[PDB]
């Protein structure tokens, strides 16, 4: 995770009324505004998620890693979203059981060859059971500071 752009305004708590399409469109807004991705970035993330899901049934907290083709990204970035209660995502492994996701790591990766690096970083982050449990209670700045340290 080298040169990944991440700010305090890339962290959000989404309300309890949201669907997955609302989550994707919410998490893309701060990226689209800064000019990190194209204007219709949300659409392509929604389209890909249907065909190729990004749900990871990890205990205790389910995790989503929604993204799209790298041609739609300009400058590398990541947007974190916390959910009030579980939202159902399809399993990325191809199991029929759903994934109750609470933490969403929206990836906007411009280089395809460093996708596996960002994924490996996420897997290491979501392995830390203590940190993941704290993400559910920490506020926007507390989450930024915790994650920003993990990137550096």
């Amino acid at each position: 995770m080298q040169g990944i752009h991440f700010r305090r305004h890339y962290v959000r708590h989404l309300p309890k009324e949201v669907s997955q399409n609302d989550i994707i469109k919410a998490l893309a807004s701060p990226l689209i505004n800064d000019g990190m991705v194209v204007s219709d970035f949300a659409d392509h993330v929604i389209t890909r998620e249907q065909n190729f899901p990004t749900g990871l049934p990890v205990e205790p907290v389910g995790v989503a890693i929604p993204h799209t083709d790298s041609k739609y990204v300009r400058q590398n970035a990541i947007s974190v979203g916390i959910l009030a209660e579980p939202v159902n995502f399809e399993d990325a492994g191809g199991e029929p059981d759903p994934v109750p996701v609470r933490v969403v790591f929206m990836l906007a990766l411009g280089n395809w060859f460093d996708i596996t690096n960002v994924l490996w970083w996420i897997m290491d982050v979501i392995q830390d059971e203590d940190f993941m449990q704290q993400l559910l209670v920490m506020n926007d700045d507390e989450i930024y500071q915790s994650i920003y340290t993990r990137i550096s």
């Epitope: 890909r48 083709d69 596996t116």
Partner: antibody, heavy 127, light 107 residues
Framework: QVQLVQSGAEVKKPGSSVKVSCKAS????????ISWVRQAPGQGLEWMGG????????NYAQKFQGRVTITADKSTSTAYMELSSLRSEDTAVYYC????????????????????WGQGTLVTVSS | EIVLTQSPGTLSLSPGERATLSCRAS???????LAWYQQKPGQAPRLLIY???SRATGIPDRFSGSGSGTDFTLTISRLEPEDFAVYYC?????????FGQGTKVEI
């Protein structure tokens, strides 16, 4: 330590299509990028495309976009490359290549550069 | 697309000497996305360097990479007869990944 066992050689007629397979072993399959690189008989290396199997879609080079199809079977740890509308130009040795890991054995992050290679699949196009 | 021009085209050296290979890029590639390969006849490429400077696992300290932006260089310090082969440079900072034409190191 990773093995990439490719399929046998193919003798194809012009206009037909070929499906070459790459069987991965010795490490995790879904969490790493598998690329396909070509080399004409007395020529240099040429990146066709690649796929990260946990995620869905393949990445393609613009020259091959339209007649190359790269897929990955999670349930058999086998990556495939299908090249359609075979021209005489397409006569080459086709390699599947998997990125390395920054560390000994199975340990560490991915490096991107292709540390592991298949034996090579020779495809010849002639009527 | 980014074109990688290698230099020299062919290089004949006696064993024990230092070989200096170059890889010129059409555009600036960040140092973290350039690799070097060795390929003997009738074999697959072998990864030497990956981080422009960083060594692949099991590769000796005889091989060393360096450079930034447009100019990159592979340096073989002490040439053994096993080292005489074709050497390629690769960019994977953006799609699609492109290779050099190759520098043949001869005896």
């Amino acid at each position: 330590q990773v093995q990439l066992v490719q399929s046998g050689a193919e003798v194809k007629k012009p206009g037909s299509s070929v499906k070459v397979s790459c069987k991965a072993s010795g490490g995790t399959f879904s969490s790493y990028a598998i690329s396909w690189v070509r080399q004409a008989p007395g020529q240099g290396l040429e990146w066709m495309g690649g796929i990260i199997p946990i995620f869905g879609t393949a990445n393609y080079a613009q020259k091959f976009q339209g007649r190359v199809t790269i897929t990955a079977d999670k349930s058999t740890s086998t990556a495939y490359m299908e090249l359609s509308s075979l021209r005489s130009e397409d006569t080459a040795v086709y390699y599947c290549a998997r990125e390395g890991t920054t560390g000994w054995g199975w340990l560490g992050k991915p490096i991107g550069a292709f540390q592991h290679w298949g034996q090579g699949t020779l495809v010849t196009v002639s009527s | 697309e980014i074109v990688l021009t290698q230099s020299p085209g062919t290089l004949s050296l006696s064993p024990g000497e230092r070989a200096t290979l170059s890889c010129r890029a059409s555009q600036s590639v960040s140092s973290s996305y350039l690799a070097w390969y060795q390929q003997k006849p009738g074999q697959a490429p072998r990864l030497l360097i990956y981080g422009a400077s960083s060594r692949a696992t099991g590769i000796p300290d005889r091989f060393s990479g360096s450079g930034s932006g447009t100019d990159f260089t592979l340096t073989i310090s002490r040439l053994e007869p096993e080292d005489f082969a074709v050497y390629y440079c690769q960019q994977y900072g953006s799609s699609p990944s492109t290779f050099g034409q190759g520098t043949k190191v001869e005896i």
